[model samples]
Target: ANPYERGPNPTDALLEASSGPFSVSEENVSRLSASGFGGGTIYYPRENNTYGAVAISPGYTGTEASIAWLGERIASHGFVVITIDTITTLDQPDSRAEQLNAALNHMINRASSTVRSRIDSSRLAVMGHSMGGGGTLRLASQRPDLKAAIPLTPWHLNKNWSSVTVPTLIIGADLDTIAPVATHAKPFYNSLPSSISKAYLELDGATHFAPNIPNKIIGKYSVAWLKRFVDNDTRYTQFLCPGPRDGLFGEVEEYRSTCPF
Candidate 1:
């Protein structure tokens, strides 16, 4: 039953459309109001049986299609990846909060089956860009069940992150004026409780949106980070929850803990 354990199925070549390798499913989420919008895509592996799913939220005015490539690439790393569209009108706090809650609940309630049986809900993690990055922090703070949160260059921090109890991984760009390190990431990181496992990484040369997608560095590191907490691959923790002196300029700085768990 392991999709990747024996390597990519020989049938994958026959199943894949000439365009590329991807499987799209049109299933509706029963709990949320999203009827036509509830389905997701799955990327089957050429090797290995384990899989990991990520809930991706995009910045304001961002479309789910724009970020699907990121999720697919993560899926290529032997995991089932997902990115949901959680749109908020007029930047209202209540609206943002509600949509976020809906997305989390939907993922939690996903049906179990032979194909889905490999999904480890307990190992789930959330990742987002811009406004969605901040939303990741906010939502995970409210829901203690979240195993990990990765916010890529989060936007304004109007809310306090001091109460965040879940393990948080923050990726920041050194020169991003839109989500400046000093005013946004730094302040929020400082406010977090020491009892919680959290890390703040600042990537050089990249701007606000640079680190959101997959690439040579971010791609490799993101896979490792998710595997650390979501797939239980402790070997990659150094990248997820690194310390001040750890990692390179291209990589994120890490800070982490597991107090509540």
Candidate 2:
């Protein structure tokens, strides 16, 4: 039996909607008491059913607010999602990786009883914006136990991610100048081992801030990716296999993957 499957059968409409089947809730973690990183907010489903968790980080010079909208809505799709702040706005990607790690651990070990009880500690993931996205890749490389990782238009000094074996979905903005997909996202995606489950989705005409706001395409693929890898729901494999065509949707500029994942 698939104990990890948390929702009803999948549909394009369901994942494309702003929310999912679960009612969601939130909890605030003040930086005053936070462990390794600056504090932020955690959003989770109201139900008692266990779910995988994900931590999201903003880009350089950004705060948790930049990604809070994503955290709340993503939780509705059956994840314990947290939008976090780095210890410092200028914290480098490596430092942000450590902070993301702390935030995830805090959720697992120190979050409120309501959040803790709902988390499947073993099934966790990390995500980020620019520098935060860089942090996501860094953490994924080191943490083989992670179920998934998503880096949105990530900016980083190091480009090679061949060491990372985590199931990763790197979402890039096609028109992004801040962290150009040509140099950042594409290379990062290329560097990941073909042996691992990985995919790269470049948003058509999207900008670096695309991940900062709520976009249905991001929601659709992200939910699908996490569902397939994090939740172990093979039902989601169809969405991943065919994925989205480039110009057909007018939202995906390009899509690449090691399919049948």
Candidate 3:
């Protein structure tokens, strides 16, 4: 059955949990000078199994540190995450997309040795905030192999997002004037094909910075979406489906999705 096509259900107990069961660790991948990809911080589970990987880019005028919290949160949940910085903070969405792709490629190239071997390069995802978020959408549209995408308060001058096919979770804020939900996030979400599993989450009274900072609601949904789409873990479907209608502690104002089973 379609999860979003239904009414609200009780919030999953797991969503309320503080953190995932994985022991997390971080490393600075400083060896990618040749690929045009700059240095980035890689966060991953210290466990033995190979897990899905995701590349995250910070928005325009933002560095990898701006979104570093998300990397730690996602990695704590068992995914290998790399938060990258563009050659320059002012780089456009397209340039950011290039950097994100380069980072993912570098990870794939290094998968044979050391800690990189713990990542399942075959299953990959991308995420970002603001301009970086728009870049994530563009990258997903261009790279059909990507398993999932999460765009947080994406900002793009052009609205041509019909080509995006990857399963996506678009997070937007109602009060964000910079990349207002009306023009950027909502349109991007609506433009995606119904055949592709997608979701739109609008945070109540949130600013453009909401998605970048640490928020329990963002952590819960993002982790669930990635787990379901990137890891193909059905356990997360319960959290995505039945939607977070009636809201999650009154923070989520609106939630919609063509829930994937």
Candidate 4:
């Protein structure tokens, strides 16, 4: 039974809107000198209910502000999102992974406090762009506790990620030469085992920065992925299964996924 092929179409309004039902709030944490990691901003829905949490990192030579849009966008949809900075912009994927894990831990520790009680530490995920995107995959490979991972135009020198069992969504830009789809994203997607759910989406005519902001199409699928996997909400399964075949937005050149994991 393919879950994605049988359900009714998702609500367009929900996917296109900037904010969801809950009001959004942000908290800025200062640098953690003890950990040798830079500071981060956390975004979460203000409603008093538990929700999944995600940690995000920016690309090489990128700052937390560069990926802050994702924090707001994902949080607006009933999730806790954290955008972090590495000790240095030139830090490698391995170092970025450590910072991401630290940020995730910070969010989990904060869950006990009143301000972050809505955070469901148990349901966690990671996301990133370019070098950060590569780090996102590396983190998921190292941490099986992650429910899902999204790597946008990931830049990695290695092509051996067959051990990554986490459900992953790999996004690539057709026009991106920095981290071309042929070399980075597609091979990474192909390396994943079919035993775990996976997906690859290539945006036509898009640049490496396409996934940086909350585009309507990307937002639709991202929310669906997090909702379906992180929150264990079956309502989003339809969007993940069957996959987007045709009538996609002009920007979406191709979309692929293996549903019913």
RMSD of each: 6.7, 1.0, 4.7, 3.8
In terms of lDDT, model 4 sits at: 0.81
Residue 37 of model 2, lDDT score: 89
lDDT of 4 by residue, 1-261 (tens): 532221234575776677665678888877863154587888887777778889898998999888887778888887889888888899888788888888888887743375368676778999988999999999999999899999889999988889998999998888998999999999999998878888888877788888776676677777788877887777787777765653455447788788786
Off by over 4 Å in 1: 1-50, 88-97, 108-115, 238-261
Off by over 4 Å in 3: 1-18, 31-34, 246-249
Candidate 1 overall lDDT versus native: 0.58
**Highest lDDT model number:** 2
Clash list (residue pairs), candidate 2: none
lDDT, candidate 3, at 239: 85
Question: Which lDDT value does model 2 have at 117?
Answer: 96
lDDT of 2 by residue, 1-261 (tens): 889998889899998898898999899999978999899999999989899999999988999999987888789989999899889999999999999999999999999999999999999999899999999999999999999999988999899999999999999998999999989999999999999999999999899999888899988888898899999999999888867887765558999999987
Among residues 3 or more apart in sequence or in different chains, the pairs in candidate 4 whose N, CA or C atoms overlap within 3 Å are: 4-241
lDDT of 3 by residue, 48-73 (tens): 77888899999978988899888888
Q: Which stretches of candidate 2 lie over 4 Å from their true place?
A: none
State which candidate, 2 or 4, has the greater lDDT.
2
Q: Provide the lDDT at 122 for model 3.
A: 86
Model 1, range 20-129, lDDT digits (tens) per residue? 23343323333245432333433334443445556776777775665676666666655655566654323433344445555544554643343355455566677777
Better of 3 and 4 by lDDT: 3
Superior by lDDT: candidate 1 or candidate 4 = 4
